[model samples]
Target: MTTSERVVDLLNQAALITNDSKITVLKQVQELIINKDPTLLDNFLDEIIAFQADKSIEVRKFVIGFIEEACKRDIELLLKLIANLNMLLRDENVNVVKKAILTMTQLYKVALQWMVKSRVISELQEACWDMVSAMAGDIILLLDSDNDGIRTHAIAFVEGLIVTLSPRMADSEIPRRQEHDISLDRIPRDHPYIQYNVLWEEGKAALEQLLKFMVHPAISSINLTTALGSLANIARQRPMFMSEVIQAYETLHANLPPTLAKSQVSSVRKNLKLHLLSVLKHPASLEFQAQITTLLVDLGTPQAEIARNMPSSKDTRKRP
Candidate 1:
């Protein structure tokens, strides 16, 4: 049979089968779509989109998997795929909706990156901006999702936005400055969205949203760690945000209300401590090191022990 004929033949055969057979045949079709036909691919493409809401969640997921891979060959297909996922976001099944959100978050990053990668932003890149913006709104609203996983990923998506849009070379330009005194004249201002002022505010806003989740002791360690890690990256990648990171951790630490002894604490506190440790040590914050050390000590971190490893000698001697 021709590639087109074989695709049709297998899909037709697969339609008549049960769960096991459907997966088996679709697996073959998945391979065929990746390695084989186009005219036939188009035939199956609509069929796949139609089945994205198939009565079976398994089948619906299969359709999602198909398109997820298909996008590698056809990026433009993402526009259509996301609309379907937007529908899927309201799915009666939380599992399906959660999975769709996860997939959408991955694509969300790529869309934003594409805008940054192109020197001259144009129609496609602008389209991607709108695409990611809408998706971001959806994710932010999902921050209150009843499902823990959804809520977790929603914060993560917000975190991703900060890292993607925030300025680089910030530390080099500002070096070590007082936290509240920082500004962003060093960044390119004419860029459409990733401008320093625009993204810095965005990063700030995202960090604020993260603090709400970071303080919740009920959140899973992975989510808390991921959220805290992203918040810390604000300081690592954009030192101006270090105060926010440190302040958030300080709040969490204070709420811990340390005992006479340092036994186990909530995961939220642990995650905050780990992230704050790294953020304090970041080279960009050398000027704040003493203040940071004081705060870490307040949180029961061994700032004195860590300081012992600091520069014991200067590599340069002053000119006489």
Candidate 2:
């Protein structure tokens, strides 16, 4: 009867069509949404949702993509789609699960930003938040999973989650043009989101595990670099964590992991040095200058070079 009905008919066809045809059909449906058809979800929401558990990885991945795109268009879709998202998180196929993690990461950011801006929540929104929170923990556990690829994606998800959930920087504290783009502090203090202590505790545990894993003697070079890189990004975003991040880098540099070959060790050490310098250069990490300087000296950074790069600050309590 209408364009919405046409989209629903095409989506409904996904149930009976061959997997090959289903891809084509789903592509058409996806294009409509991406091309600005906002009305399709009204009639075909359930039709499209049923495909979240499709037998093909291609279909499942598409479903995850669709849900992410839909949530971006309408945050209200979170409640309707989060259960399927949780199901995909536990998917048996690594590809499916990895896609789920990536999607969940984007959705997590979108949902939290929505919560902060809206300043109120419905029962459905609260339930969606609970489910997304649980999934966040599950994704964090993947940081220790045996698969390095999955672990890499999981690392990214945690990085985004931590940066999004951490408190916003004070306006006076933010350097010119360096204000934090996303932070939980945007949410009103009276809002229920402020009371979710479990999330803060979970975020703390994730960071602790990342630091511990970064120093493990048996960690792969890939994991080591990803963990350190993630930590550096976090430190830059949330300066409150800068002290511990600096400490983690120093410990790893001192006892370079034995599992690495001579070449691997050199490259890894170079990465560590770069992050150390990067952190040292950040204005927010001025409080940790003493330790960073010492670590740089131990890593063989020339005194002349370090002096040229460092700001030479004695104000440890520079933060307000």
Candidate 3:
């Protein structure tokens, strides 16, 4: 049979079988969609997305993966895929919800990039932005979740979303020579949405929300490391926020949470030092080096080690 014919046959077969067999067939369809027939992929998306609300956990999880891959291939499909994602976001099973959260973390970036690329938004397309905004706000609330796993994922989602929404630094200003990831730079300077104009305040608020996790008395090592790591990332990319991030680090370092277990305490401290050390070496953070170095020393890092890790003096001397 032709690849398209095979996909049709499989979809028909999946509908007739039990959930287990449906997964088996879905895997075959997944492989075909990815490898054999990418151009015709969109033709089958509606049928594939129909499985998103399936009662079986595995089936629902499978659909989430399919939606992520499909949208990654054709970002325009996000307009259709997002509602399914939102449905799965509040899924009864935590596993299903986490899977959906991870997918949103990725596709949300694409949605923003698409908006920048398209430039002009049709009435229907504009509503997709509303859905994305509402869904993102929902994910932020998960940062306060009782489940550590859910909270960790939410923290990551917020971090990624914030960076993508933050104003893009000029290529000369950024430390890197080649940046491949999508950010606000893709938007035209004249566009109203450039620099996340509509969402700048929300991005700042999200960064503050992300920073607050570090000082929670009962925070786990995973959450603490994730937060610090995020701060380090944001500081490097958006040097304007470097000082604020350093202050957050200093405050947390000085007042280590007393409730953590000895092992957890060390784990978090080590990660803090690790993230700060990398940030210290980042060329973009040149102005904040003194404060970062002081904090590293306060955290017990040797001054000699810090000297060795600093960006070469030559790069610092030149104004790019």
Better of 1 and 3 by TM-score: 3
lDDT of 3 by residue, 186-255 (tens): 6566775434466677888898888787667777777878888878888877766778889999989887
- TM-score of each model, paired residue for residue: 0.75, 0.86, 0.88
Candidate 1 lDDT tens digits, 1-320: 67767777877888888664487788787778666664455557776577675688877767766766676566656655666767776788777776777676566655544455456876655665676577677777777677777777677667666655555553422224323222244335775555557656765676677777666656655565677776776677666667777776766666643331145464545555566677755665555667667666765667565574343223112210
Cα lDDT tens digits for candidate 2, 1-320: 76667676877786579755687888787777555577666556676777776788888888888888888788888888899889888888899889999998778877776766666677898888788888998888898788888888898898878776667554123434435455666655666564545556666777887788788887788888888888888787677788989999988987888877466876886788788886776676666677898898887777887776675444234553
The TM-score of predicted model 3 comes to: 0.88
Ranking by TM-score: 3, 2, 1
In candidate 2, the residue pairs with backbone N, CA or C atoms under 3 Å apart (3 or more residues apart, or in different chains) clash, namely none
> Number of the top candidate by TM-score?
3
Residue pairs with backbone atoms closer than 3 Å in model 3 (clashes) = none
* Residue 240 displacement (Å), model 2: 1.3
The parts of candidate 2 lying over 4 Å away from their true place are 12-24, 33-35, 116-121, 170-181, 196-199, 312-320
Best by lDDT: 3
C-alpha RMSD by candidate, in order: 6.7, 3.4, 2.9
Sorted by lDDT (best first), the order is: 3, 2, 1
Q: Rate the local accuracy (lDDT) of all candidates.
A: 0.63, 0.77, 0.79
lDDT of 2: 0.77
User: What's the lDDT for residue 265 in model 3?
Assistant: 68
